[PDB]
């Protein structure tokens, strides 16, 4: 009397996330046929790691956890197990320690709409807007940066107003955050050349320890902590405390996009994590 897991219905949902905002669904206490599943989704490839694929048939699991996202065409090879490419460094790490299977499938492009969303709350706090891209453009991060909850990317207006040369943009930082660190420097034809942190940018930072944005490979189960921001593009020149600290659109670095479409279908990936083989009530009915 347990219901069908309906895994195919979720995989075939026309709202497909990108790797940046990959979607997990946990299936449990339900019946499924792997044989039917591989037919109802236009499967290109299904294979398993740390697990004998033939053993799914007729088995029960505590739960089955799927993580899905559309594939940017140029980055498909990033999904090879252990790949150091962009997708697994900075969007979704395929855990090689679990019992897992990797599914490559596709949907007719005419129905798919890619849902792009930046999961980083600190990016969004400092002005990251919804993406404005074509409906099959798939966003992926190239670099992720983590920050403390006290992070603010803007120089302090009162510091900037003392800079005679190379004034940084400035704005008020939210209550509970710390202003961007800056120093007045001497260069051979300027005596108040202000130099702040994360220069030239967080990706190429000369002094990574002094840059508050910390390069962060995604861990198992994690989303990108955030795109790095060019702090010279957060705030405004001569910005006072009456301006709220925000970063311009071009301040957010180290991300790209590509279409998922080839031969009029959008290519999609789902990871499968098999939890607790020979227990629970997530059961294959393939042998019944």
């Amino acid at each position, epitope marked *: 009397d347990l219901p069908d897991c309906d895994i195919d219905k979720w995989l075939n949902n026309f709202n497909v996330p990108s790797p940046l905002n990959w979607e997990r669904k946990i299936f449990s206490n339900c019946n499924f046929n792997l044989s039917t599943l591989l037919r109802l989704v236009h499967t290109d490839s299904f294979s398993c790691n740390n697990f004998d694929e033939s053993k799914i048939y007729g088995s029960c699991f505590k739960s089955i956890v799927l993580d899905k996202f559309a594939i940017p065409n140029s980055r498909r090879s990033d999904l090879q197990l252990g790949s150091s490419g962009f997708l697994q*460094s900075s969007n979704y790490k395929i855990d090689t320690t679990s019992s897992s299977c990797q599914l490559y499938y596709s949907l007719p492009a005419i129905n798919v709409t890619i849902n792009n969303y930046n999961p980083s709350s600190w990016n969004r706090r400092y002005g990251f807007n919804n993406f404005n891209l074509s409906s099959h453009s798939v966003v992926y991060s190239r*670099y992720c940066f983590s920050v403390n909850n006290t992070f603010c990317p803007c120089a302090k207006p009162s510091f900037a107003s003392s800079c005679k*040369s*190379h004034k940084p943009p400035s704005a008020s930082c939210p209550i509970g955050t710390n202003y961007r660190s800056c120093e007045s*420097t*001497t*260069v*051979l*034809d*300027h005596t108040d*050349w202000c*130099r702040c942190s994360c*220069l*030239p940018d967080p*990706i*190429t*930072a*000369y*002094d*990574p*320890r*002094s840059c508050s944005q910390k*390069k962060s*490979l995604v861990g198992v189960g994690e989303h990108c902590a955030g795109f790095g921001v060019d702090e010279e593009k957060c705030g405004v020149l001569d910005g006072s405390y009456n301006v709220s600290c925000l970063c311009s659109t071009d301040a957010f670095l180290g991300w790209s996009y590509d279409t998922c479409v080839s031969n009029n279908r959008c290519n999609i990936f789902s990871n499968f994590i098999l939890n607790g083989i020979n227990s629970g009530t997530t059961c294959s009915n393939d042998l019944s």
Partner: antibody, heavy 124, light 108 residues
Framework: QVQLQESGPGLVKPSGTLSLTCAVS?????????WSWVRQPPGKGLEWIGS???????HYKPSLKSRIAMSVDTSKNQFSLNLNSVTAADTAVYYC?????????????????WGQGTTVTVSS | DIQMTQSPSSLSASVGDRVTITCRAS??????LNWYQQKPGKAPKLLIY???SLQSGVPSRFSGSGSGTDFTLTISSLQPEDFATYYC?????????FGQGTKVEIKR
């Protein structure tokens, strides 16, 4: 193919100003490279003293901050070092070097294409 | 400042020996670690950058390993022209800092 060449007077009087220039060939000073000075006192190891990018951003050895300044000249493809109020503690071989980043995720800066060095003696 | 400490400070080896030099940073510096060779009367020369990347043109008998605080330079088969002082250097922070140097002497 980046090659560097130091120039400047080797003898500086005590409390005088040391001024060195480094001319860059085979590559543009206007690039992602930073440009660096590293000195080596007699019988001692290596001590970085400063680096600067053509945007004007710079970092110096903190104990020298009150005496040191660098410049990057995009019109001559050169960069320079000024060290004020010198004493015998500043006698050394001064090398210029390219400080560029690696192509990995970490973008690790390293020194490369070192100049041959110029010997500076602080003496009356 | 991040202090870099090399071990040993000097060593003597024969042609064809494996030479091993280690370097420790006073705090973690991930892979921001470079190795230089300085021969008598010459400027330092880059051997290894980013802890394990061999500089183009440098013989493959040189190799680096490590991450965090502890790093290793290995010369797989010492040659006479490898007489030099070797330096590690971190670029995770400012100021840039160098290890004290390790002198490699050649026994013959």
């Amino acid at each position: 193919q980046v090659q560097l060449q130091e120039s400047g007077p080797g003898l500086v009087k005590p409390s005088g100003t040391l001024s060195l220039t480094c001319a860059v060939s085979g590559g543009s000073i206007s690039s992602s490279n930073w440009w660096s000075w590293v000195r080596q006192p007699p019988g001692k190891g290596l001590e970085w003293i400063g680096s600067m990018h053509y945007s004007g951003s710079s970092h110096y050895k903190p104990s020298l901050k009150s005496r040191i300044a660098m410049s990057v000249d995009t019109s001559k493809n050169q960069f320079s070092l000024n060290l004020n109020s010198v004493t015998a503690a500043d006698t050394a071989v001064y090398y210029c070097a390219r400080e560029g980043g690696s192509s990995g995720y970490d973008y690790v800066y390293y020194f490369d294409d070192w100049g041959q060095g110029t010997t500076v003696t602080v003496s009356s | 400042d991040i202090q870099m400490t090399q071990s040993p400070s000097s060593l003597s080896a024969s042609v064809g020996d494996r030479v091993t030099i280690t370097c420790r940073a006073s705090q973690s510096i991930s892979s921001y670690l470079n190795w230089y060779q300085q021969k008598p009367g010459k400027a330092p020369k880059l051997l290894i950058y980013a802890a394990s990347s061999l500089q183009s043109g440098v013989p493959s008998r040189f190799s680096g390993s490590g991450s965090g605080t502890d790093f290793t330079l290995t010369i797989s088969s010492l040659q006479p022209e490898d007489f030099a002082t070797y330096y590690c250097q971190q670029s995770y922070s400012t100021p840039r800092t160098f290890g004290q140097g390790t002198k490699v002497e050649i026994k013959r």
